[PDB]
Design a protein around this nucleic acid. Structure first.
Ligand SMILES: [Zn+2]
Ligand SMILES: [Zn+2]
Lengths: 95, 104, 137, 106, 82, 97, 82, 95, 54
DNA sequence: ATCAATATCCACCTGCAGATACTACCAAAAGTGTATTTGGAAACTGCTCCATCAAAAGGCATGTTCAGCTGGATTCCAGCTGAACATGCCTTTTGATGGAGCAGTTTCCAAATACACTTTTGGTAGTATCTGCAGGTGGATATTGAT
DNA sequence: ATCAATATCCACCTGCAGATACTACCAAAAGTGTATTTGGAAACTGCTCCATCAAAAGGCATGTTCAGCTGGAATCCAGCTGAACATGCCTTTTGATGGAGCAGTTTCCAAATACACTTTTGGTAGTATCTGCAGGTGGATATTGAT
């Protein structure tokens, strides 16, 4: 039988129900959102891999991800995204 | 210091602006599906014969084409206004495409 | 240069009613000056800050800065170690005190608040989706 | 008794799946422990940002369901997102209403 | 066969595409130019799509081939898979 | 005395500066400006010589290209003088603004 | 602390850069514009160069940092290493 | 300095000597050619890796390289480059 | 290409100016290296037709 | 049509910085052989999605007319840019010193990988089902154009 | 300013296509626990290149003047585009049919990997050497601009 197609539909729906607790979403809009997530993921991962290559390291760490975020996102997006990532990493390692 | 702390006729150009608003409000596709499909098939046929297309493939091509042409027309309109005109002419298309880097 | 002054005090970096400087875009609270100024009895005329007053005093000439600082260090022979220090204090606009960061980071449960306030892990957190609460379900 | 990693970090996006995609994607020979956590955090942040803007655009249009037109309006009306997605075409998103000043009648 | 078909991009369709771009007055000779530039763009994209397709040893052109051929020219396209 | 009509020396200069490959900005002022700009992202920075040379090369290439586009937009409007609106149009079409 | 330093890009230098671009007559107000655009370009490149440098935990900005910061903006540069 | 900096100087000089027998080359021009070779190499390699990821393959083969050459180079260049590559491979395997 | 451009200039050695003149004078090579800056390469000599005298 | 005045290039010498070899030499990196796993190639097969036909009906494209308004050409005029001097200043160099910073070596130690289980979670079909929204209609409203 | 004629928007209503939803269910995969290996962090060191001065030399930048040519405004006029109407034609929708091509399943075997050893080789350094070229000097002359 035909295989399964993993996607980001359920997590996007969770985030939406958090920000706007009573608005739905279409299906073409959810397709746009999956494509957006994949594109941004690929961009950040490619930049982090380039960084790790330049410095003769063989490991991608949170430092590479943070520098890639600083390189890729413009302006205040970078500040807020760095805040979020740092907070999440700190909470994860505190447990 | 500061301390500041007899049949009705519309005048030429009216229906143009009405259409501009109408088509900048909408989101549909502005070309007919069948002629565009035939055009795509002719081109791909002179590239590699005996081809087949999913429907979503031709739909993607149509969306990309229309987005491209709308952007080109915006740039053309700026280049027309720059020379103190209202009418767009082919030289404006050529200038916009040359500055974008698509031709030279 | 028809600029406008900042919307925050240059000293404490907070908001309020400011006495402003005309030359530079700095603005200060009234108690955040040296010495603090009475909001009622404010001297009208041209108010300049400490830095711009230092500049206009030296006429924006630093050869004269050489001159006056050499003479100053020659005079303060009693405390020669604190000579240059005692000369720089007169070129700075006032500040408020904030601990150096090599002191705050000895204790990891201590975090600087929003306006430079103390927080010690007993602060719950500000409520973010309680901006979402004013909207509510 | 087995918690997830995204629940241990306090996220909605999956940390295990992002970790796997980083591993099998040919990006580096090794992948740290906090790289997927950081990446999931920033992905969730950007998602929430654009979704909030699009939901506002949907509300002021008297609707109760987000469509690609609302995503296009939200993206093109913000400066940072328009910088981030400047070379992206959204399928069936339309354009921004804009008529040049010299064209309007006077 | 499938010859001609470039005049199938009629003049009203180009006028609509211009109205969506904000144009108020249109010349008489821009229809030829628009047909030329559309043909050029289409050839440049279809060549790459067919290259991908035939590398995969297929006979059907998938939508992913099109979005790849577009992405490789700085014309990323959201909403069709990927 | 012997004078040249306006524009003659301009064409001479165009040919002369298109025949050459040397740099056109002075090195010391550009170096000072680069250091002052970088003074805002991090204090106490050091630069290699080749870093500043690369920056000068890239900047000059960028400005020459921009001036070509600007001259195009000026000839479009039946003019010979380039004006700031020409620069603004060339940068808007390019996508920089 | 360096100040102004932007008027060091004199008017004759900009006239030379224009002559190499083929310009025959120059206005009076383009010098301000050129200084503005040069400053913008330089900030955009130097920010990325410094980012690379400080990720490598160095204090000296290498030429490779500059060519990387340039390559990441579609301004590839040959002849300086790489 | 113990570290060695491998480059393409000697190979570019061999190519030059067979193409133009009595023409030298400057050092700056040699650096230009070095950057050119590295740039084109990483372009082709990145495209090959991408179109091997698309097809759920693990090996980079002659086919991936040929398709990357066809995708990256313009018409006549791509035709001649494909000719050269196939000639080299068939001479290699029959050796 | 660059060696031909150099010999046409009556020189014996290739300099970056010759590489630039060779790249920018070809069509497909110029399309392959359109977004590339070559150090000390200069530009291609051309003046617009309306700027010329008379 | 003539001619002085520049500015450019053609011809020749020369001192020198850069290109060209050679030995050393030396890691050090590539080629040779071999045992092993595994990923990609063949063959089969089901089924899904594409191409072809068909018809019919209405919405869109086409051709024509008429007139208004826009684009282009001509004149003029003022003011703004360029060309040529005459000072003066600030860039270039090149020589030397100080010294911070970066690259190489050794430990070691913390962290990421590999493997086996086991429960959870996210996805697909089937089927379901509400419900938001698109289509149709009328009524009010704002705007346009000629008096 | 008036008024009449159109196009757009708002309010109401209705059917239905799409979004929320289990349930099975279920299969894939993520989290947990050990043992191992290896890559990255820390201290030390030396030597390299970057900053900071100094001191002329002269080549470029700055300010002034003058005039001429170009950009901008005003007029006029033809011609070309738009707006509207009638006509037909061809796109879109619904529906069925054949059937080719794609995706999954099993087998299996040709090839890429991992290790260990030996041999070129190509890269840095002197180390030396030499010559192609950048700079300087004279003279021919091609072009410009005023007569
Ligand atoms: Zn204050
Ligand atoms: Zn002040």
């Amino acid at each position: 039988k035909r295989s399964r197609k993993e996607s980001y539909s359920v997590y996007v729906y969770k985030v939406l129900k958090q920000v706007h607790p009573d608005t739905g979403i279409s299906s073409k809009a959810m397709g746009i959102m999956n494509s957006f997530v994949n594109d941004i993921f690929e961009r950040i991962a490619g930049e982090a891999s380039r960084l790790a290559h330049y410095n003769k390291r063989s490991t991608i760490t949170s430092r590479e991800i943070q520098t890639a975020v600083r390189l890729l996102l413009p302006g205040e997006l970078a500040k807020h995204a760095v805040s979020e990532g740092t907070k999440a990493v700190t909470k994860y390692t505190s447990a | 210091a500061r301390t500041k702390q007899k049949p009705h006729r519309y005048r030429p150009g009216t229906v143009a602006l009405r259409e501009i608003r109408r088509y900048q409000k909408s989101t549909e596709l502005l070309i007919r599906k069948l002629p565009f499909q035939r055009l795509v098939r002719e081109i791909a046929q002179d590239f590699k014969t005996d081809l087949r297309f999913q429907s979503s493939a031709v739909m993607a091509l149509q969306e990309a084409c229309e987005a491209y042409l709308v952007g080109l027309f915006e740039d053309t309109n700026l280049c027309a206004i720059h020379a103190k005109r209202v009418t767009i002419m082919p030289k404006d298309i050529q200038l916009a495409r040359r500055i974008r880097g698509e031709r030279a | 240069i028809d600029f406008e002054n900042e919307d925050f005090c240059s000293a404490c970096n907070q908001s309020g009613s400011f006495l402003c400087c005309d030359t530079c875009p700095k603005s200060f609270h009234f108690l955040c000056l040296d010495p603090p100024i009475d909001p009622n009895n404010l001297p009208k005329g041209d108010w300049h800050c400490n830095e711009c007053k230092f500049k206009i005093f030296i006429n924006n000439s630093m050869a004269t800065l050489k001159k006056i600082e050499s003479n100053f260090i020659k005079q303060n022979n009693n405390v020669k170690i604190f000579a240059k220090l005692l000369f720089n204090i007169d070129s700075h606009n006032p500040k408020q005190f904030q601990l150096p960061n090599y002191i705050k980071e000895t204790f990891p449960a201590v975090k600087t608040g929003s306006r430079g306030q103390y927080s010690d892990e007993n602060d719950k957190i500000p409520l973010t989706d309680r901006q979402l609460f004013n909207t509510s379900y | 008794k087995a918690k997830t990693r995204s629940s241990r970090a306090g996220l909605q996006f999956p940390v295990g799946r992002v970790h796997r995609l980083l591993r099998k994607g040919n990006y580096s020979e090794r992948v740290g422990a906090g790289a997927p956590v950081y990446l999931a955090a920033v992905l969730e942040y950007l998602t929430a940002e654009i979704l909030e803007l699009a939901g506002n655009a949907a509300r002021d249009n008297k609707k109760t369901r987000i469509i690609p037109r609302h995503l296009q309006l939200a993206i093109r009306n913000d400066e940072e997102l328009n910088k981030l997605l400047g070379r992206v075409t959204i399928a069936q998103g339309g354009v921004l209403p804009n008529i040049q000043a010299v064209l309007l009648p006077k | 066969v499938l010859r001609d078909n470039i005049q199938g991009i009629t003049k009203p369709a180009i006028r609509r595409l211009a109205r969506r771009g904000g144009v108020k007055r249109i010349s008489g000779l821009i229809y030829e130019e628009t047909r030329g530039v559309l043909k050029v763009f289409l050839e440049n994209v279809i060549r790459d799509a067919v290259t991908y397709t035939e590398h995969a040893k297929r006979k059907t052109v998938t939508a992913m081939d099109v979005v790849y051929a577009l992405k490789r020219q700085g014309r990323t396209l959201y909403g069709f898979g990927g």
